[PDB]
Design an enzyme around this catalytic site. Sequence first.
Site, PDB file in Angstrom:
ATOM      1  N   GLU A  44      15.757 -36.451  34.168  1.00  8.71           N
ATOM      2  CA  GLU A  44      14.927 -36.890  35.459  1.00  8.71           C
ATOM      3  C   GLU A  44      15.021 -38.473  35.528  1.00  8.71           C
ATOM      4  OE1 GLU A  44      10.785 -37.708  36.444  1.00  8.71           O
ATOM      5  OE2 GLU A  44      11.008 -36.538  38.080  1.00  8.71           O
ATOM      6  N   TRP A  65      11.821 -30.492  40.190  1.00  5.77           N
ATOM      7  CA  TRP A  65      12.113 -30.691  41.620  1.00  5.77           C
ATOM      8  C   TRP A  65      12.176 -29.552  42.698  1.00  5.77           C
ATOM      9  CZ3 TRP A  65      10.857 -34.777  43.778  1.00  5.77           C
ATOM     10  CH2 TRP A  65      10.451 -35.836  43.015  1.00  5.77           C
ATOM     11  N   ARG A 112      -0.320 -44.753  42.292  1.00  7.68           N
ATOM     12  CA  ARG A 112      -1.109 -44.545  43.317  1.00  7.68           C
ATOM     13  C   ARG A 112      -2.032 -43.258  43.181  1.00  7.68           C
ATOM     14  NH1 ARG A 112      -0.338 -40.554  46.077  1.00  7.68           N
ATOM     15  NH2 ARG A 112       1.279 -40.048  47.244  1.00  7.68           N
ATOM     16  N   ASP A 117      -2.385 -37.730  37.460  1.00  6.30           N
ATOM     17  CA  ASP A 117      -3.067 -36.417  36.821  1.00  6.30           C
ATOM     18  C   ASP A 117      -3.132 -36.798  35.381  1.00  6.30           C
ATOM     19  OD1 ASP A 117      -3.117 -33.728  35.627  1.00  6.30           O
ATOM     20  OD2 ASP A 117      -1.671 -33.190  37.273  1.00  6.30           O
TER      21      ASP A 117
END
Lengths: 315, 315
Positions: free
Chosen positions: A60, A82, A218, A221
């Site tokens: 990634e 994705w 911002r 998790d």
Amino acid sequence: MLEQPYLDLAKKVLDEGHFKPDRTHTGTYSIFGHQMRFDLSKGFPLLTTKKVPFGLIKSELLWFLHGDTNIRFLLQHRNHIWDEWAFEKWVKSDEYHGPDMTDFGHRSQKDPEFAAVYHEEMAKFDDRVLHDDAFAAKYGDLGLVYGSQWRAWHTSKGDTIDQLGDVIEQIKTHPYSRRLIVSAWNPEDVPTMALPPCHTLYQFYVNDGKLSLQLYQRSADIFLGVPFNIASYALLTHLVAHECGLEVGEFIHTFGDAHLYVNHLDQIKEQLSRTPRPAPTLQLNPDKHDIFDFDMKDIKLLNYDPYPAIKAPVA
Amino acid sequence: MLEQPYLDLAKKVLDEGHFKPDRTHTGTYSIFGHQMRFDLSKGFPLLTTKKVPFGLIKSELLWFLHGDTNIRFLLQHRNHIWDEWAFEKWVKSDEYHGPDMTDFGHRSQKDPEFAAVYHEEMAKFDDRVLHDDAFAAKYGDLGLVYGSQWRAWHTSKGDTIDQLGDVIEQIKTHPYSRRLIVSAWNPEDVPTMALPPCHTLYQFYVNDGKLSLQLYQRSADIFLGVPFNIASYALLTHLVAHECGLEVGEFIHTFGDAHLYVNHLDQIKEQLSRTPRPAPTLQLNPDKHDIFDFDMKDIKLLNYDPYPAIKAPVA
């Protein structure tokens, strides 16, 4: 132990978090504001307390570094992070004449076989992307993703700014700059799009001939996200350090809202009773120094002996 | 005591800072990465340990809030914080047929009367701006300043986005949003311009029916800057809170590079031997709720009993 600032975040969210009804209400515990540091000279901050896929990570980050936005790269690496995105926009109008899937991330969670439809339909799509140039070009390109806004920001006057490549140009001439900043946030795209970035802003810095990196994320998790994220940017800190010829300093992870979703408290509770192990050494190719010309087999990671991975559902 | 996180920053920079040759070398002590919190329910975080001009602050925040960019507003309030900027671009070519002033912020510091030239020349300019519409329009408008990129971001397609006004529109409908973010950073302007923002990015947040605000500032001057900055944004946190009808929570000040310049260690040393006093209560107009329609006399500050202000030179 290297990954402890992790573990401490979740201890904090767990007993200092607030409940927010905020999904489809669903629930979260969330804190606003948190720095966290990793000294990248001690190790690679890949969590040892649950198995995390470093290859889903180093692929990634190589998509990002190649300025890539098309799904096809990733699917050529068994990398399905994705897909969901692209598939949604596929199942939007045309050639799509098959079983609608509104809210499939729920209908396909509150399912039984509404899972096999999606999982054949997706088998399918992923294969379309893989072999149909034609197709790939149109649906598998996601367009505004991180690699796009790192390396080709669309400017009002018509060009494309390789914002990362230029900042890497200033590390090597202006190491003492206070403006080594790449943004992925674009004020105008932001409201059209699906996923306004979490990995909002990053600044690098040099002192003592070592590179430290700071990320402003911002939303986060704690369970399912942050363990994977710590590694993307801890790897970025090592390859930029690697190319500008300097040493690796530190990685500082700053969070606006950190949150654990309620269906993850169990797992995160159990992870916490484990005892972190000596962390893996990261180690990259000397003969190669072109980081945008890096491939998979030139970032190697060694000595990652985790505990078992903990399955959790996404909320 | 409310302003102690301040004082602690400078204690940190002082004994944990690093020397960076980075001005015109000149010197600094600098740390990379620091959050700092202020509970805005205890008080207004205007430093009590040296007198700070709250009116130079509440004017400057009213320019920003009016979408303003022309110098003239400020100079109609005895506010000379932005002059230098505009004057430089004035003394660039035309009508300017007078005494060149390259490096005047140095020639006018390593001077004696090279100070009176500048200070008559500036007396002059400021007066030109004040009365010559014609002039003001051309030189006193600085163009890309915070009020410009808060309230009118130029988008590639031709419009202007009132990025703050829209986020204030989402506080009142979407208080639980994780995207209440205004940016002043523009990737393409950034390299043309003089002063790429320090006050880079801000995010608001709501829980418990109270507004907390987080600022990412990229470069900071512990002595001369940060005391003034804490107040601009602590005031912003109170007026947005004020207009969206909610209460004031907290203000979190996050810094990428914090630095003290070497010619300030004396003062900051002396400030530190003082003992912070009960902080001023901020208090704003109920009958008025239009914050972009606020003027000076509707933000009042009371009970600020500082110690003497400490003069320091800017470096």
